[PDB]
Amino acid sequence: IPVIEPLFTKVTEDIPGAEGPVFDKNGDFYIVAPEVEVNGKPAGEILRIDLKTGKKTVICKPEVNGYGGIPAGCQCDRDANQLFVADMRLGLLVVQTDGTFEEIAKKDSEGRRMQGCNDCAFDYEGNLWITAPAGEVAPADYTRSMQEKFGSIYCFTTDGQMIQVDTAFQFPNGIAVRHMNDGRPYQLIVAETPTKKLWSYDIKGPAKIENKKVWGHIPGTHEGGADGMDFDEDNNLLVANWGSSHIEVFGPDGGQPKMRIRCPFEKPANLHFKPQTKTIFVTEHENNAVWKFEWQRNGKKQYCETLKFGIF
Ligand SMILES: [Ca+2]
Ligand SMILES: [Ca+2]
Numbered sequence: 001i002p003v004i005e006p007l008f009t010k011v012t013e014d015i016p017g018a019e020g021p022v023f024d025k026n027g028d029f030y031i032v033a034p035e036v037e038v039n040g041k042p043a044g045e046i047l048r049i050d051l052k053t054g055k056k057t058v059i060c061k062p063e064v065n066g067y068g069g070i071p072a073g074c075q076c077d078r079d080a081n082q083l084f085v086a087d088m089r090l091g092l093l094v095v096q097t098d099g100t101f102e103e104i105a106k107k108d109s110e111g112r113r114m115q116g117c118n119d120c121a122f123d124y125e126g127n128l129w130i131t132a133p134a135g136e137v138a139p140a141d142y143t144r145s146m147q148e149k150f151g152s153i154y155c156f157t158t159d160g161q162m163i164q165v166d167t168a169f170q171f172p173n174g175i176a177v178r179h180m181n182d183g184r185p186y187q188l189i190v191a192e193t194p195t196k197k198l199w200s201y202d203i204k205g206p207a208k209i210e211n212k213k214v215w216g217h218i219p220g221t222h223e224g225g226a227d228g229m230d231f232d233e234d235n236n237l238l239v240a241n242w243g244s245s246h247i248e249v250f251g252p253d254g255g256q257p258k259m260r261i262r263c264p265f266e267k268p269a270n271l272h273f274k275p276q277t278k279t280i281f282v283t284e285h286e287n288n289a290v291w292k293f294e295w296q297r298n299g300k301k302q303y304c305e306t307l308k309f310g311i312f
Contacts, residue, residue, distance in 0.1 A: 001023070001257055001259065001260055002077040002258075002260070002280065003260040003261070004259065004260075004261055005261075005262045006261065006293040006294055006295075007294075008263060008264050008282070008292070008293045009139070009291060010054070010291055011049065011291055011292050012031070012054040012055075012056055012219075012290045013054070013287065013288075013290075014138050014288060014289070015031055015033045015047065015056070015270055015283070015290065016034070016036045016037075017033060017034045017035030017269075017270055017285060017288065018031055018032075018033065018269065018270075018283035018285065018288050018289060018290055019031070019033075019034055019228075019268055019270050020032040020071065020072055020119070021053055021074075021272040022074040022076055022084065022272055023034065023076065023146045023272065023275055023302075023304075024076045024081050024097065024302055024304070025076060026083040026091045026294075027275065027279070028048055028097070029048070029051055029058075030043065030046065030049065030059075030074060030076060030083065031046060031047050031049055031283060031290055032044065032046050032047070032071040032073070032085065033045040033047060033158040034069075034070040034071055035036060035048075035070075035288075037068075038068070039120075039136075040072050041067040041068055042067070042069060042142075042310075043072045044061070044065070044070045044087070044088075044096055045058045045060070045071070045246055046059055046060040046061075046062070046074075046099075046101075047059065048073050048186045048195075049290070050183055054197070055079070055293045059095075059097070059098075060095050060100070060101050062085075062087065062093060062095075062101055063183050064103050064138060065138070065139070065141060065277055067089060068089065068091045068209045069087040069088070069089045069090040069138075070087055070088035070096055070134075071085045071086070071087045071088075071090075071093070071306075072086055072087065072088050072117070072118045072119060073085065073086035073117070073118055073120050073122060073131075073269055074086070074120070074237040075117030075120045075303070075304075076302065076303075076304035077094075077122075077304060077306045078101075078122075078126065078305075078306060078308060079126075079309075080243065081097060082094055082095065082096050082097070083095040083096075083159060084120060084122070085101075086116065086118050086119050086130055086131070087117060087122045087137075087188070088116040088133075088134045088136055088141060088142075089116050089134070089138045090103055090134075091103065091104060091114040091117055091137045092104040092105060092114075092117055092120070092128075092130060092146070092154075092156060092162070095162070096206040098258055098286060101153070104156065104162065105156075105162040106137065108154065108163065108164050109162055109163045109164070110163075110164065112164065113137070113140070113155075114132075114136070115134055115135060115136055115137065115139045115151075115152050116132060116134025116135065116137050116142070117130035117133075117134070117154070118131045118133050118134070118172070119131050119173060119174050119175050119228060119270070120156075120175065121175045121176050121177050122171065122177075122191050122302070122303035122304075123177040123181045123203065123303070124177075124184075124185055124292055124303060124306060125178070125185060125206060126158045126303065127155055127156070127158060127185075127206045128155065128156040128157075128262070129153070129155050129165075129177060129188055130153065130154040130156060130172070130175070130227065131151070131153060131173055131174070131175045131191075131214070132151060132154055133145045133146075133152065133171040133172050133173060133174065133193075137152065137205070139309075145169065145170055145172075146163035146170070146193075147170075147193060147302075149168045149169070149170045150167070151167070151169035151170060151171050151172040151192075151283070152164050152166065152167040152169065152172070153165045153166040153169070153175075154198055155206065155207035155209075157206050157207055157247070158284050161207070162165075162282060163208055163216045164186045165208075165209050166201075166209065166212070166259065166302060167197075168189070168208060169192050169199075170192055170195055171192060171194055171196050172190050172191065172192055172227035172241065173191040173192070173193045173225075173226060173271070174189075174190075174191035174202070174227055174240070174269070175188070175189065175190050175229070176230060176231055177189075177203065178231065178235060178252075179300075180219045185304075186202060186203050186225060187200055187201070187202060188200065188201045188203050189210055189215060189229065190218075191218075191226035191227065191228075191236060191239065192225075192226070193224065193226055193227065193242070194223075194224075195238075196217060196218040196219075196225045196226070196294060197214050197216070197217065197218065197226075197227070198214075198215045198216030198217070198218065198237075198239065198250070199212060199215055199307075200212075200213050200215035200216075200254065203271060211260055214284060215246075215254040216250050216255060216257075217256055218239070218244075218248060218256040219241065219244060219246070219248065219257065219260070219283075220241065220244045220261065222243040222244055223239060223293070224241070224242035224243025224244065224267070225242060225243070225244075226240070226241060226242075226248075226268055227240040227241070227242040227268070227270060228240045228268075228270025228271050229302070230271055230272060230273060230280075230299060231300035232273070232296070232297050232298065232300060233298045233299060233300050234251070234252075234281070234297060235252045235300065236250065237250040237254075238250075238261070238271060238280070240271055240282070241268065241271055242267050242268060242285070243266060245262060245265065245266045246260040246262055246263060247260070247261040247263060247271065248260055248261075249261065249270050253309040257272045261283065261293075261308055263284065263291075264291075265284045265286040266269075266284075266286045267284050267285040267286045268282055268283075268284045269282075269283045269284055269285050270271075270280075270282070270283050271283070272304040273295070273298065273299025273302075274292075274299075275299075275301075275305055276298065277299075278294045278296065278297055278298055279292055279293075279294060280293055280294075280295050281296075290297045305306070
């Protein structure tokens with residue numbers, strides 16, 4: 001498998017468990033610090049990063065009734081400049097740029113207790129696909145599916161329903177949606193970290209997924225595996241292989257990576273393209289920092305880059 005070694009440029013440093021890199025509608029950059037804790041208790045943070053200086057600004061430090069959050073993944077909204085944040089302790093959160101936030105759900109559409117989330121991905125229809133590797137949200141005791149298969153997948157629909165679409169995963173992590181050239185969502189990719197697998201489903205409609213399949217295989221026997229992911233404009237899936245020192249590049253049909261990207265660190269966690277560019281921002285847990293490098297082409301437009309009233 002061909003490996004490239006692009007130049008990685010330092011963006012910012014010292015962010016415990018640096019995760020969920022994301023750009024909002026105004027081009028501002030955000031990162032979440034899930035592993036920040038106070039007195040042994042979760043006290044996760046959501047930060048804005050000044051790309052010109054690397055200076056960090058904590059805009060939100062979510063907590064619900066004394067229970068601190070563990071924000072781990074983000075997606076920017078289209079109709080409003082707000083962030084949808086997967087929180088390992090609080091479920092799904094909607095965070096405004098002013099730092100205020102709201103907890104989306106304590107229970108799912110079936111009345112079942114909500115599970116802590118890790119990452120999410122908006123499809124072009126506005127539906128949010130979320131991975132939930134943690135156990136029940138606070139106030140319940142914190143648990144995570146690294147050893148046992150109790151990780152679930154959710155779809156937070158346009159009509160405000162939090163629907164569980166699948167369960168029994170051993171730490172569902174990264175997640176992405178593949179669209180047809182005309183914009184129709186048709187495939188969901190879900191990373192299952194410890195098992196070194198990438199799972200796929202056919203998206204038949206909002207919160208409707210069928211034909212679960214082992215779509216891709218993540219290299220290595222190291223502890224870790226597929227973490228964050230995103231598609232480039234040609235629908236190549238770039239996957240952060242935590243603990244392998246590489247970002248795997250899968251072709252449209254999956255299977256084995258068709259290319260690997262060597263990182264100057266052992267633990268790449270998550271990534272995100274800068275709108276209209278080939279620039280990919282990467283967070284890593286060896287140094288707990290954020291970097292950037294140039295990929296071969298532009299990223300696939302995120303939902304926040306599309307237009308609700310666009311003609312084409
Ligand atoms: Ca993750
Ligand atoms: Ca991303």
